[PDB]
A and B are shown apart, each in its own frame.
Chain A
Amino acid sequence: MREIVHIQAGQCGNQIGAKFWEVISDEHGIDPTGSYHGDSDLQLERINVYYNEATGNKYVPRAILVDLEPGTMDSVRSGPFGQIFRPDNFVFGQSGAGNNWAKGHYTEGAELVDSVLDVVRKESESCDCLQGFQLTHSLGGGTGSGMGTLLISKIREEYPDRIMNTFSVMPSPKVSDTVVEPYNATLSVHQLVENTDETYCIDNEALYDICFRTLKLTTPTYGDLNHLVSATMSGVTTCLRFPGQLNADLRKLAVNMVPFPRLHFFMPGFAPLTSQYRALTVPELTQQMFDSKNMMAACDPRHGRYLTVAAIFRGRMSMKEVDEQMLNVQNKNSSYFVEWIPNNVKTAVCDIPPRGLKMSATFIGNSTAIQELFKRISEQFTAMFRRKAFLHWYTGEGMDEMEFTEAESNMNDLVSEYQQYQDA
């Protein structure tokens, strides 16, 4: 019956995790108390994938809230749908991880991780058939980045044949907490390459630009950025939450998206970008969602090639028109799909749209231009690490320079692995 266990970790993790659950609890008819008050019953067919059944059969998310400080988490639970979350599923330390990967992965996080795996175990033991885990987190902080990849190291150990799937927010100098972010993120990516099956790369650069250039928000807030993420995340997961000709689970998704096991970082895109009264026509949905301006990862798809693509349209619309338009975008732009993976673009449609939009289209691209993101983070990293700058924050927690060059190395390789398939 194919559940996912959702884990949100850190400040960014739990803020984005929080909106995602209100966004889709609205989509499933669940109120802030956990009680279902929807019209359809398609709202309840795949409900079990994200929600456990409850009291007078209310619905609690299958979510685990993780942090090394309580601040964000108190904020979540005193926020809107903060009541729906199982209070036992609030696992938190007190010291924080100081924007420090090592504190999350080796010291502070190490102390807390066992308590989290107790909650993952009780959430997952109550699963007739669990299919995988999805983790939300940033990679530039300490908790979501350092502890989050520790958690994945552990979940992989206890559950080696489940899918591990993350939504990962990349640091960008444009929208930065601290200067050590490329360090934290290079170290997280070394982990993600090994221990996840699929990672959606949400770049904070791109969310800023969409907010500024497109949505016309002069100075965007983190809430404005997480508006775009909770809409993409709702989008990316509608197949798992709603029934269709597609019997969509994490493993089938990974099987068709990932040709080579390391190359599993996806460029999400969304259309329309909203912060609106004419529904977009299908020809625009598909022109927009493939436009670089609607990508969440801040890489130009025309700078690389799509290994694989997965698109979904939400609303009631011409199933033939999306077929036609989808097939048409491939031939206007066949230079940008790989000749050696036949039929590498797959398209689903859902009759139920997101709140407020009558027609929406979400895009998932395994493009070799995602390399730009890692090239970007790698330049920044080297820029500091050549002068060994800010390293004391990490050597103070047991880490050695060697661990750093290995992480620099594994990511420069991943960039080579991506360039070689751009040339084929």
Chain B
Amino acid sequence: MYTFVVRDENSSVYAEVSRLLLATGQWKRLRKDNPRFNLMLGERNRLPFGRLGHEPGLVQLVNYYRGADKLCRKASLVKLIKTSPELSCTWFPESYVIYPTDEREVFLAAYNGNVWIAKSISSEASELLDFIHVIQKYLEKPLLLEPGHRKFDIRSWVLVDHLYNIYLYREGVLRTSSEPYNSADKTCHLTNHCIQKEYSNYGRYEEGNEMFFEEFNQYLMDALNTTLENSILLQIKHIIRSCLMCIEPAISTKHLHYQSFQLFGFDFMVDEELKVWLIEVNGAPACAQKLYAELCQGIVDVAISSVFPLASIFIKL
């Protein structure tokens, strides 16, 4: 008989697994501050990792990896790809880090196109720094898909259990900015639910803009004579293996007193050579509505009940 607290309430994904756990008659939600729990569904940040693994007779596990922010904030992220030997790296955009660490002449030697993207968009290396924060290069020519000239964006969901098996969810989502896309005018330059759920027509050339994988593969075959696996997913699996295995000796809970799993959202981009690029690693990712049921259950099989037995949908990397 298993216990678990919930300490992140508005966690879209984990709200659902908290549902599924109770709905097996073998898991009980205690109050946030009850210490005698089997499983923490911890808070986004300031998660008190130092207080796990200290309750006698309790196998404790939490849905977060201490140290994984180093992959998940672009400050630490960028830093990781230059500092670490295991990352040389031909799939991350060239990058630096500015404060209103710190080294800035870095940004000069490369300036002879020269367009970059402002957030943490312009071609002028001056109006940007008025923000006074990471600020880097915009793929002036992406892959652009049709019928309708829709510039898109790929999210993959990766699960990492207590054993550090890397699990790619087979269902990715493709969040398209299904409208045109021009030059210089800062609307389709940004493709998700932050400038298109407020500023930017919320699903023109299909259902809510949102291509899932079966369709995008069929398009790729018909539109390009290739498959999603070969053109992109190989590169995606390579990116995921490479990030998570860089930081493994720093966040592995193999021989420590508690244990961690965590679900990540990877956000990629493509160009026309079907080169895949990595933008951001999300440490607290929300799922795509149609997929919540299947992903949230797969979390339980592989990350939760693998450690707490009772009475595939993932590709192991």
Q: Are A331 and B56 in contact (CB under 8 A)?
A: no
Q: Are B35 and A328 in contact (CB under 8 A)?
A: no
CB distance from B54 to the nearest CB of A (A): 10
A297 to B240, CA, bound (A): 62
Would you call B163 an interface residue if the criterion is a C-beta within 8 Å of the partner chain's C-beta atoms?
no
A334 to B1, CA, bound (A): 12
A324-B57 contact in complex given A331-B36, A332-B1, C-beta closer than 8 Å: yes
Q: Are A342 and B35 in contact (CB under 8 A)?
A: yes
Taking CB atoms, residues of chain A closer than 8 Å to B133 are none
Q: Are A331 and B35 in contact (CB under 8 A)?
A: no
Would you call A327 an interface residue if the criterion is a C-beta within 8 Å of the partner chain's C-beta atoms?
yes
Taking CB atoms, residues of chain B closer than 8 Å to A327 are 56-57
Q: Are B3 and A331 in contact (CB under 8 A)?
A: yes
Closest to A342 in B: B35
Taking CB atoms, residues of chain A closer than 8 Å to B34 are 334, 339
Main secondary structure of the interface of B (DSSP, over half): loop
Closest to B57 in A: A327
Would you call B33 an interface residue if the criterion is a C-beta within 8 Å of the partner chain's C-beta atoms?
yes
A334-B30 contact in complex given A339-B35, A342-B35, C-beta closer than 8 Å: yes
CB distance from A276 to the nearest CB of B (A): 30
Main secondary structure of the interface of A (DSSP, over half): helix
Contact residues of A between 309 and 366, Cβ < 8 Å to B: 323-324, 327-328, 330-332, 334-335, 339, 342
CB distance from A309 to the nearest CB of B (A): 14
CB distance from B22 to the nearest CB of A (A): 15
CB distance from A282 to the nearest CB of B (A): 14
Would you call B52 an interface residue if the criterion is a C-beta within 8 Å of the partner chain's C-beta atoms?
no
CB distance from B297 to the nearest CB of A (A): 25
A38 to B251, CA, bound (A): 60
With an 8 Å Cβ cutoff, the count of chain A residues facing the other chain is 11
Would you call B58 an interface residue if the criterion is a C-beta within 8 Å of the partner chain's C-beta atoms?
yes
Taking CB atoms, residues of chain B closer than 8 Å to A335 are 30
Q: What class of interface size applies to chain B in its complex with A?
A: 10 to 19
A334 to B29, CA, bound (A): 11
CB distance from B282 to the nearest CB of A (A): 33
A331 to B3, CA, bound (A): 8
Question: Which of B1, B31, B56, B57 is close to A339, meaning CB atoms less than 8 Å apart?
Answer: B31
A328 to B36, CA, bound (A): 10
Taking CB atoms, residues of chain A closer than 8 Å to B57 are 323-324, 327-328, 331
A335 to B56, CA, bound (A): 18
Convert A288-325 into 0s and 1s, putting 1 for each residue whose CB lies closer than 8 angstroms to a CB of B: 00000000000000000000000000000000000110
Contact residues of A between 251 and 273, Cβ < 8 Å to B: none
Closest to A332 in B: B1
Contact residues of B between 1 and 54, Cβ < 8 Å to A: 1, 3, 30-31, 33-36
CB distance from A316 to the nearest CB of B (A): 22
Taking CB atoms, residues of chain B closer than 8 Å to A332 are 1
A327 to B56, CA, bound (A): 8
A342 to B58, CA, bound (A): 15
Q: Are B1 and A330 in contact (CB under 8 A)?
A: no
CB distance from B258 to the nearest CB of A (A): 16
Q: Are B31 and A331 in contact (CB under 8 A)?
A: no
CB distance from B48 to the nearest CB of A (A): 14
A328 to B56, CA, bound (A): 10
A324 to B58, CA, bound (A): 10
Closest to A333 in B: B36
Taking CB atoms, residues of chain B closer than 8 Å to A334 are 3, 30, 34, 36
CB distance from A345 to the nearest CB of B (A): 11
CB distance from B127 to the nearest CB of A (A): 54
CB distance from A48 to the nearest CB of B (A): 35
A332 to B28, CA, bound (A): 10
A400 to B58, CA, bound (A): 58
A332 to B36, CA, bound (A): 10
Q: Which one of B1, B31, B56, B58 has the highest number of Cβ atoms from chain A below 10 Å of its Cβ?
A: B56
Contact residues of B between 48 and 101, Cβ < 8 Å to A: 56-58
Q: Tell me the A residues contacting B by CB distance below 8 Å.
A: 323-324, 327-328, 330-332, 334-335, 339, 342
Q: Tell me the B residues contacting A by CB distance below 8 Å.
A: 1, 3, 30-31, 33-36, 56-58
Jot down 14 A-B pairs with beta carbons below 8 A, ordered by A.
A323-B57, A324-B57, A327-B57, A328-B57, A331-B3, A331-B36, A331-B57, A331-B58, A334-B30, A334-B34, A335-B30, A339-B31, A339-B33, A342-B35
Q: A323-B56, A323-B57 are in contact. List 17 more A-B contacts (CB 8 A).
A: A324-B57, A327-B56, A327-B57, A328-B57, A330-B36, A331-B1, A331-B3, A331-B36, A331-B57, A331-B58, A332-B1, A334-B3, A334-B30, A334-B34, A334-B36, A335-B30, A339-B33
